[PDB]
């Protein structure tokens, strides 16, 4: 608990440049005696990481500040702000005294039914089916499915499931389930979903039609080393990532793609192999 | 106490989302003694009724009838969003009340590796309303520049700073990862309220792409919770550009199944963008004459 108060001290010193005793009392429900104890024990242990400005009556970081308790990370903080903007993280867990002005891109899909999600979660947990009326892109029909995982593509949640009427694994968009009922026992093993369990590396590069000035900017945004960034992804998610990034669209102007997927052919081939390998495992299990 | 009410929402959350509650769940999650647990289970049954039963086999309490949360505002959207916060590491596992996590995954965030010192100087410039001179690789050239940050914006993939461009005499977005050198500047004479593209919110009128079949259109209407065949979403004009590009609503030759959506008022949004940009520049000039 006290170490958390020292990371807080250092968080205030690093990102906000100043610390009051009242910051600790208000954020951690500690007494002013305890606050004086923590600053002293902190000063004893971090040395001249902290200084007292008698003018502002605040504690300030020294020029030599080396965090000793706090692992400083911009990506963790920026990620933490997003959790606040979506309401997933309450304001009390964000240590800013003053929040920076900010916004994010609205999430469009929402309004998931709790009972739908409850029944889906029960089926996953119990390794059971559910009967669903599912609106696909090709038809509405009643189907029995056995959920095994949840996947978020960046916009929508889908359930990864055994399709009981097809003896294969497929994705079902949660918002496209229009009626849901508890089902029966499905005989399947999730280890047979080779498209789910296989991880592949995406080979992302600047779009070959970019100029050096364009290519240098793209390399910096996506932290490329040696002109590329490798990203491991499940084959099931690689599809969503490829389509979402329009890496399937070959005729796009260079400035909109920014990226190319150098190994897109192997990924497409691997998806086809995963579906075929899955079928072989399914049949071999059903025959045992 | 409000302390206890948090324990009753927890009871109801476990009964609802997991279908079972152990005695150890209250003791482990809230560090309470077995006597206190007996009080809480008793007062819950007294307030929620005997809508619950104890299974000696699983060592769990299970609901008997149909769950009627009285303390917990059940929300799937809150939970799934909370799961997203876990997958990104912004929320620790200890704050998620699942005993066993469902199997899950998400699309990787590619941008990362922001310099912490860069963000510190950016955050300081925003807070003190000062400029910083920055070396920025834009899409058109790399150059050293003075910028006066006023807000941060996340487009869905990358973080950018919305800033006064002290030289271009306009407000613009700067990709955080494209700032390669940064130094503290002075106080800049600018008003964040002059960035009418930041301050203007517009409603996007999103509809299914008209080339979808009815069956395709019905699925798209369901995925994006359209009402009356449309979806309205409020967005800043500055952010509307990124939203349009992210959703490919600018690309007319895309197959309907890849677009899924169309933006019915795209011309008006484009009009609204141009008027705000021109008016912002005019407002800038009235200050520049002072």
């Amino acid at each position: 608990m006290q170490n958390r108060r020292f990371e807080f001290i250092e968080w205030k010193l690093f990102w906000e440049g100043a610390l009051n005793r009242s910051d600790l009392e208000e954020t951690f429900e500690i007494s002013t005696p305890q606050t004086s104890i923590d600053l002293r024990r902190y000063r004893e242990l971090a040395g001249d990481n902290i200084e007292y400005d008698a003018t502002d009556k605040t504690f300030k970081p020294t020029k030599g500040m080396k965090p000793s308790f706090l692992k400083v990370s911009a990506d963790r903080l920026l990620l933490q702000l997003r959790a606040l903007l979506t309401g997933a993280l309450p304001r009390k867990e964000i240590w800013f005294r003053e929040m920076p002005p900010m916004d994010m891109a609205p999430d469009i899909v929402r309004n998931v039914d709790p009972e739908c999600l409850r029944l889906v979660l029960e089926a996953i947990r119990l390794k059971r089916s559910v009967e669903v009326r599912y609106q696909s892109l090709t038809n509405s029909r009643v189907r029995e499915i056995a959920p095994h995982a949840l996947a978020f593509d960046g916009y929508r949640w889908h359930v990864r499931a055994w399709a009981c009427d097809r003896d294969d694994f497929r994705d079902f968009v949660l918002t496209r389930i229009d009626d849901i009922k508890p089902g029966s026992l499905a005989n399947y093993d999730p280890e047979d979903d080779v498209e789910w369990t296989t991880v592949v590396t995406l080979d992302l590069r600047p779009h070959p039609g970019l100029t050096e000035e364009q290519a240098l900017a793209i390399q910096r945004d996506y932290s490329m080393s040696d002109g590329m960034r490798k990203i491991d992804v499940r084959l099931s998610m690689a599809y969503y990532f490829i389509m979402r990034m329009n890496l399937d669209l070959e005729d796009l102007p260079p400035a909109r793609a920014q990226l190319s997927l150098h190994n897109i052919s192997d990924i497409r081939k691997s998806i086809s192999e995963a579906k075929s390998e899955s079928k072989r495992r399914i049949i071999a299990r059903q025959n045992k």
Side-chain angles (χ1 to χ4, degrees), chain A residues 2-109 111-288:
Chain A
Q2 178 166 74
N3 286 290
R4 191 58 172 200
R5 294 196 302 276
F6 299 164
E7 38 179 295
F8 176 87
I9 287 168
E10 291 186 345
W11 188 105
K12 296 288 284 194
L13 292 175
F14 190 90
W15 296 113
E16 285 192 306
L19 170 75
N20 299 250
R21 290 188 175 87
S22 65
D23 287 300
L24 270 157
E25 291 170 39
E26 293 167 304
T27 302
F28 294 94
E29 300 176 348
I30 62 170
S31 68
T32 307
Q34 182 56 57
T35 299
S36 300
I37 290 166
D38 290 354
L39 286 167
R40 188 186 301 233
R41 283 174 182 171
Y42 175 72
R43 285 172 176 273
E44 290 165 7
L45 296 171
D48 199 29
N49 270 176
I50 193 178
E51 181 182 53
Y52 185 65
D53 191 55
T55 309
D56 295 338
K57 300 176 180 173
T58 68
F59 298 75
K60 292 183 179 172
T62 330
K63 185 183 178 177
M65 181 60 180
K66 289 180 185 179
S68 65
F69 302 110
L70 178 70
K71 295 179 182 181
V72 181
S73 167
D75 312 337
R76 185 174 184 107
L77 177 58
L78 290 176
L79 184 68
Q80 207 174 126
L81 293 184
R82 283 179 37 180
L84 180 69
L85 289 170
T86 64
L89 192 69
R91 177 60 186 94
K92 342 174 186 170
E93 298 197 49
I94 305 296
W95 292 341
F96 279 114
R97 179 179 292 281
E98 293 311 358
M99 290 298 303
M102 63 182 187
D103 205 54
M104 65 179 284
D107 305 337
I108 311 157
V109 175
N111 292 124
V112 175
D113 179 67
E115 182 65 32
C116 181
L117 181 60
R118 190 186 72 72
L119 288 176
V120 166
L121 287 168
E122 179 170 67
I124 291 172
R125 182 177 61 246
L126 298 182
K127 302 184 178 187
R128 287 338 177 223
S129 67
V130 290
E131 181 183 335
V132 295
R133 184 168 189 75
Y134 185 81
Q135 181 69 55
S136 73
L137 293 176
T138 56
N139 53 51
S140 190
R141 55 178 172 96
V142 182
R143 308 181 71 140
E144 192 171 291
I145 67 171
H148 78 80
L150 297 178
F152 183 72
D153 69 13
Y155 298 112
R156 49 172 211 47
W157 284 93
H158 67 254
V159 59
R160 192 50 183 187
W162 178 252
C164 304
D165 68 311
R166 294 291 176 68
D167 295 335
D168 66 9
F169 297 97
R170 308 181 180 213
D171 306 349
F172 297 84
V173 180
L174 204 60
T175 57
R176 299 188 191 173
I177 301 172
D178 178 50
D179 295 315
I180 181 163
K181 178 167 199 147
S184 72
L185 277 162
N187 183 4
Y188 77 104
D189 192 342
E191 295 171 10
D192 292 341
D193 192 344
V194 184
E195 209 180 342
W196 184 251
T197 56
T198 305
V199 177
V200 291
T201 308
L202 304 185
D203 183 350
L204 300 175
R205 304 189 186 184
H207 184 281
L210 293 177
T211 58
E212 187 175 48
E213 210 76 8
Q214 287 169 140
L216 285 175
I218 295 318
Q219 286 177 66
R220 285 186 63 88
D221 51 298
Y222 302 116
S223 178
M224 294 176 167
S225 55
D226 303 323
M228 68 183 75
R229 178 63 171 187
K230 292 186 180 185
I231 308 189
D232 295 341
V233 66
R234 295 178 191 277
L235 274 176
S236 46
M237 296 306 95
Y239 173 90
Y240 292 117
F241 182 91
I242 287 166
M243 298 300 291
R244 186 181 81 197
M245 299 303 298
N246 301 317
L247 302 171
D248 60 308
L249 304 186
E250 298 180 6
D251 301 309
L252 288 184
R256 289 175 176 222
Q258 300 183 358
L259 291 174
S260 64
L261 179 61
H262 187 62
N263 65 332
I264 191 164
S265 299
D266 298 328
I267 303 305
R268 284 173 174 168
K269 181 178 169 184
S270 297
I271 292 170
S272 189
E273 184 65 21
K275 285 177 184 182
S276 302
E277 177 168 350
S278 183
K279 206 45 180 183
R280 296 191 264 83
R281 292 183 143 86
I282 289 158
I283 292 165
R285 182 176 312 268
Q286 288 175 332
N287 289 338
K288 176 179 180 181

